[PDB]
Amino acid sequence: PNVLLQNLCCRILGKGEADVAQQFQYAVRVIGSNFAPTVERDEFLVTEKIKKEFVRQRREADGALFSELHRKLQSQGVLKNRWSILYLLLSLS
Amino acid sequence: PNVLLQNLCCRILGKGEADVAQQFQYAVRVIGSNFAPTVERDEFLVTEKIKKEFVRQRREADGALFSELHRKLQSQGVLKNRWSILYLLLSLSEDPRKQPNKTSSFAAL
Amino acid sequence: PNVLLQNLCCRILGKGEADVAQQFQYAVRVIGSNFAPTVERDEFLVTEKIKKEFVRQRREADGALFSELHRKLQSQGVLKNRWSILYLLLSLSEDPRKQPNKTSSFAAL
Amino acid sequence: QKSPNVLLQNLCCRILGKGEADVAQQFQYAVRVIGSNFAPTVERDEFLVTEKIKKEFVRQRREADGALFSELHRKLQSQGVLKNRWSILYLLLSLSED
Amino acid sequence: AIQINFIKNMIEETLDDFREACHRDIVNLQVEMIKQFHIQSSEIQMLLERYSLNESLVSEIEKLREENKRLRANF
Amino acid sequence: DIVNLQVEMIKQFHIQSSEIQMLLERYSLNESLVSEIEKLREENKRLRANF
Amino acid sequence: DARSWLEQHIVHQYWTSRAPRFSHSSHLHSNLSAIWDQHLYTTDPLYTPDDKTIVTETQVIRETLWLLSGVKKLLIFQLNDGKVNVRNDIIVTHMTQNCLRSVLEQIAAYGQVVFRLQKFIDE
Amino acid sequence: MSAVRETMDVLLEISRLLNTGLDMETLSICVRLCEQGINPEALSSVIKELRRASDTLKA
Amino acid sequence: NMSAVRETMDVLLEISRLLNTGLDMETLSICVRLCEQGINPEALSSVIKELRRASDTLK
Amino acid sequence: AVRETMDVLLEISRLLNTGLDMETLSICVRLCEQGINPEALSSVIKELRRASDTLK
Amino acid sequence: MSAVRETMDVLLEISRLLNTGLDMETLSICVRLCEQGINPEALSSVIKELRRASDTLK
């Protein structure tokens, strides 16, 4: 977990370090603050909320396409917790 | 970006350059702390809102006038984020029947 | 205003004439911060909220009574700060319900 | 005895799964949190709290268990050792889980 | 229309009460922010007094000075 | 939602404050350190002008 | 300062909490409540220490004087003008809380009649 | 002096009904500060911390 | 007395279990003692969640 | 472009009975074109107006 | 790594629909973080703030 947090931080600012020590320490601070999910393992609703947002941005064609992409993940049956990643995509929607 | 903020502080308040200090430290800090936008690129909700404001201020006439000047801004093609200046005006609206708190030497309280 | 807020601190605690310095220092800080109150001036709007509050603790007879008292209040003196007093009282209201816990052991934690 | 300070330490010791003096660092942190004030969402009427617990039972698809809860409530009322039933009831309601 | 406005009047009443509950929380939030910063300063203020300088030592430099002047006022 | 912001803030304050207290002590120098600086200063003056 | 002068020449307030508080005397049998409370707090695992209005020993007999003929009492709760009863937080240090309740409940029910008999008076 | 006293007395009537639970003297200070410009929200907040602080102290 | 407190505990304990809890009987006892001793219900609920969370990160 | 816009914006402010200066609006166009959140832009200026009040 | 990349392509596409720039590399790292049972709410707070920091700066 610790190094996986450090990698992520370097990659978003642009590959290779260049005084990103502070930014990693800042993210350690964030992750030590306890936040609390609103729903947990309710992946289906998290897809539904995305779609309601896409009507909200007036980007309805994107909203049809997203449904196909989630259905893809559903067929493959990869274990990581599908709800975790979708909840990430909702915050950025 | 900074230069802009300094010019807002110094100019309105007058030249202390050390008594306009407060606003300047305040300014850089407030804008740098990121948040995701709310009332952005939905100008239809904003126009309607300012019309209600006029209706409330007992100036029905100013609402039709405003709508005319609004459409004049669109044709110019300048000022990227229109909504932000409109948002600002509405916050500081006041009705012609009261006036909000003015006091000075507030530090003493 | 320094004198008035210090005397405010001393009076409420019922004692401490230079021992309430710490509480005072806090009060000077809170007041020095700024607020934007939801509903700003205008006498009608505050009177309406007070009546709803009266009904809710089941004190109807009091709601009717207050309204005469409000007209009377006005007649006795007219301010531009009238509203700030009525909103101040409003926020500072107390519910009759429940015990307000112990303070005789709650002090210790 | 049972002073607040002595009871808050015992709670922390068992829940964190570490010794008495080894839960201290969290123990201090626990005192600040309790000594910072909050006010419950439901402040008035003992009934307003009870109906909430009762609504929760239905929501979780456990209608039968909410009936059982009403029956327990009468039992609690009759013994009269506690004079702040509501605090205890709001507290379990909040810590409810599936 | 009548029933449309009926529903409309019911919802404002309910929303107003809801604003007050939210407002009370926001006001409780402010009491905590400002009060915590005030605590922090008091803690920092004392710690900083003790280890950044010794009041004890400095009083002692002034004393020795005074002892030596008094020694020289006795010759 | 409000409760979550309140309880996090206070955790951040306690943690930071404790870390701040240790740090402050480091550069300013503790009472042990002041007394020992004086010992070495007495010794050095004594070789250079009381020998 | 005038506030402090009043506070010494008048007995310390017990209708509002903003006056410091006595419940001390040098006799060994007059601090009985502090002893009684202590006992309850260690014997009973489930003891609820009340928030008690500290009174002001043997000034309860002055409130018995007023109550028996004279005015409505706003220091004690009266549910109505025909029902006088005594608040559950009154302690005197040289008795138990419960023991205290029991003498004040006799005079309460005797002041219930004179207060009721006073509502019949049509001036 | 006549005008001022007569608003306060009307003001004390409301305070006792609405269940403010403040004292007479303290209220006069609240009103003077308002007329000189104060925010209401801040002012209630300060009152509240002072109030709680007094109860705990006495016990 | 001993009997009566047990029954008081017993009923509360039944309710905690229906609602699902991670607290044992010992901890639950402590909470009640806190309730009687004052302590608004929200502060208690919060301190518990933060302490429950920290234990999982450690173990 | 900045000036042309400032006059139309100046018309709007006068209607709302809200005082802003000529200068403020022109600086605002500069901040927008660099990118500013609508909340932020409003908040700096609201406070700056109150600061000016207290100061004198 | 082959399985992680395949998933990573699916998330890269979703990221285009909402119109957020993310490197491919970061999208792979997110996968490791939720497999380890990292909190998605802390995770999002990291993604939002560091990507935004990078865009405002440049």
DSSP states of E5-71: HHHHHHHHHHHHHHHHHHHHHHHHHHHHHHHHHHHHHHHHHHHHHHHH--HHHHHHHHHHHHHHHHH
Q: Determine the Cα–Cα distance for residues H32 and C46; give it in Å rounded to an integer.
A: 20
Of D5, D29, D3, D34, nearest to D16 by C-alpha is D29
Which whole-number Å values give the CA distances from F29 to A15, A90, C91, D15, E60, in the listed order? 40, 50, 49, 39, 19
Classify residue B78 by its DSSP letter: -
Q: Which residues contact D94 (CB under 8 A, 6 or more apart)?
A: I41, I42, I45
I42 CB neighbours in chain F (<8 A) are 3
Rounded Cα–Cα distance for residues G116 and J44 (Å): 67
Token reading at B23: 């606003």
Tell me which chain E residue has its CA closest to the CA of residue C31. Answer: E34
Residue K56: how many CB atoms within 10 A of its CB? 12
The answer to whether G45 contacts D84, with C-beta atoms less than 8 Å apart, is no
Q: Which residues of K touch A31 (CB under 8 A)?
A: 38-39, 42, 46
Which chain H residue's Cα is nearest to B100? H37
Quote the minimal CA–CA distance from E12 to chain D in Å. Answer: 20
Q: How was this structure determined?
A: cryo-EM
Distance CA E62, CA E71 (A): 14
Residues contacting residue A44 through CB under 8 Å, at least 6 positions apart? none
Q: How far away is chain B from the Cα of C92, in angstroms, using its nearest Cα?
A: 19
As a whole number of angstroms, the distance between CA H17 and CA D18 comes to: 53
Q: Tell me chain B's radius of gyration from C-alpha atoms.
A: 18
Q: Which runs of consecutive H residues, i.e. helices, occur in chain D?
A: 4-16, 24-35, 46-59, 63-79, 85-94
Tally A–F CB contacts below 8 A: 13
Nearest to D35 among C97, C101, C109 (CB): C109
Interface contact J27-B87, CB threshold 8 A: no
CA dist K31 and C47 (Å) reads 57
Residue G53: φ, ψ to 5°: -80, 115
- Kindly give, in sequence order, each residue whose CB lies less than 8 Å from that of residue G68, ignoring residues fewer than 6 positions away: G107, G110, G111, G114
E25 vs F2, F10, F21: nearest CB = F2
CB contact under 8 A, E24 and D39: yes
Q: Tell me the sheet residues that pair with B96.
A: B98
**Cβ A7 vs Cβ K38: under 8 Å:** no
What letter does residue G11 receive in the DSSP assignment? P
User: CA of A33, closest CA in chain F: separation in Å?
Assistant: 6
Give the Cα separation of J54 and G65 in Å (integer). 58
CA distances from G105 to G30, G64, G72, G100 (A): 22, 10, 16, 9
For chain H positions 1-59, those within 8 Å of chain E (CB to CB) are: 41, 44-45, 48-49
Does chain A reach chain E with at least 3 CB pairs under 8 Å?
A: no
d(Cα J7, Cα J29) in Å, to the nearest integer?
12
Please state, in angstroms and rounded to a whole number, the distance separating the CA atoms of residues A48 and A63: 10
For residues D8 and D27, give the distance between their C-alpha atoms in angstroms, rounded to a whole number. 8
CA-nearest residue of chain D to G50? Answer: D83
- Report the C-alpha gap between D40 and D51 in whole angstroms: 15
Looking at beta carbons, which residues of chain I come within 8 Å of G45? 5, 29, 33
Question: How many Cα atoms occupy the beta-carbon half-sphere of I21 within 13 Å?
Answer: 23
d(CA J22, CA J27): 9
DSSP label of B96 = B
Angle (nearest 5°) at CA H42 between D38 and C52:
70
Instruction: Please count the other Cβ atoms lying within 10 Å of the Cβ belonging to residue H38.
Output: 25
CA–centroid distance for J56 within its chain: 20
Across-strand partners of B98?
B96
The two structure tokens encoding residue E16: 């107003």
Mind giving me the DSSP string for chain J?
-HHHHHHHHHHHHHHTT----HHHHHHHHHHHHT---HHHHHHHHHHHHHHHHHH-
H and E: helices and strands count for chain H: 3, 0
**Which DSSP symbol is given to H21?**
-
Chains touching chain J at 3 or more Cβ pairs under 8 angstroms? B
Query: Which residues, other chains included, contact G91 with Cβ-Cβ below 8 Å and sequence gap of 6+?
Result: G23, G33, G52, G53, G54, G55, G97, G100
Retrieve residue F5's tokens: 């912001």
Give the number of C-alpha atoms closer than 13 A to the C-alpha of residue D58, restricted to the C-beta side: 5
Query: Who contacts C37 (Cβ-Cβ below 8 Å, separation ≥6)?
Result: C87, H39, H40, H41
Q: What is the DSSP letter of G80?
A: E
Give C 21-50 residues with CB within 8 A of chain E: 22, 25-26, 29-30, 33, 38, 49
Number of residues written out for chain A: 93
Phi, psi of I49 (to 5 degrees): -70, -40
Please name the residue that has the structure tokens 């000034």. G59
What one-letter code names the amino acid at A22? Q
CA-nearest of G35, G119, G57, G58 to G83 is: G119
> How far is D61 from E44, CA to CA, in rounded Å?
53
* Record: contact C91-H7, CB cut-off 8 A: no
Asked if the C-beta of E38 comes within 8 angstroms of chain D's C-beta atoms, the answer is no
With CA atoms as reference, report the closest residue to J27 among J12, J15, J9: J9
Q: What angle do CA G1, G3, G4 make, to 5 degrees?
A: 75
CB contact under 8 A, D33 and F7: yes
Q: Are D48 and D55 in contact (CB under 8 A)?
A: no
Q: How far apart are CA B27 and CA J40, in angstroms?
A: 9
Chains that touch D (3 or more CB pairs under 8 A): C, E, F, G, I
Q: How far is CA B75 from CA B62, B68, E4, E55, J2, in A?
A: 21, 12, 39, 72, 14
Taking alpha carbons only, the member of D36, K54, D42, E19 closest to residue I39 is D36
Q: Looking at CA atoms only, how far is residue G117 from chain D in angstroms? A: 36
Residue whose pair of structure tokens reads 């005008």 in the numeric block: H3
Mark which residues 56-75 of E lie under 8 Å from F by CB.
Answer: 57
Chain I contact partners (≥3 CB pairs within 8 A): A, C, D, F, G
* Angstrom distance (rounded) from CA C97 to CA D44: 6
Cβ-Cβ contacts under 8 Å for A33 (sequence gap 6 or more) = F8, F11, F12, K42
Beta bridge partners of residue G53, listed in sequence order = G90
The answer to whether the CB atoms of G46 and I32 lie below 8 A apart is: yes
Q: Buried (b) or exposed (e) across J30-55, using 16+ Cβ within 10 A?
A: ebbeeebbbbbbbbbbebbbebeeeb
CB-closest option in E29, E47, E51 to F6: E29
* Contact between E27 and C33 using a beta-carbon 8 Å cutoff: no
Which of B95, B99, B109 is the closest to C31 by Cβ? B109
The first and second tokens of residue K56, run together, are: 């405002």
User: Residues with Cβ < 8 Å from G47, sequence gap 6 or more?
Assistant: G40, G41, I36
Flag if J38 and B87 touch (Cβ within 8 Å).
yes
Token pair for C8: 């405010």
Taking the C-alpha atoms of residue J29 and residue J26, their distance in angstroms, rounded to an integer, is 5
* CA nearest to I41, candidates D39, C48, A15: D39
Go through chain J and tell me how many residues it has: 56
Chains that touch H (3 or more CB pairs under 8 A): B, C, E, G
Mutate which of C45, C84, C94, C102 to disrupt the H interface (most H C-beta within 10 Å)?
C84
Q: What is the 3-state secondary structure (H, E, C) of F15-41?
A: HHHHHHHHHHHHHHCCHHHHHHHHHHH
E31:H49 CB<8 A? yes
Q: What does the alpha-carbon distance between residue H19 and residue H22 come to, in Å, rounded to a whole number?
A: 8
Q: Which residue has the tokens 């999002």?
A: K44
Interatomic CA distance for residues K58 and B1, integer angstroms: 13
Strand partners for G54:
G91
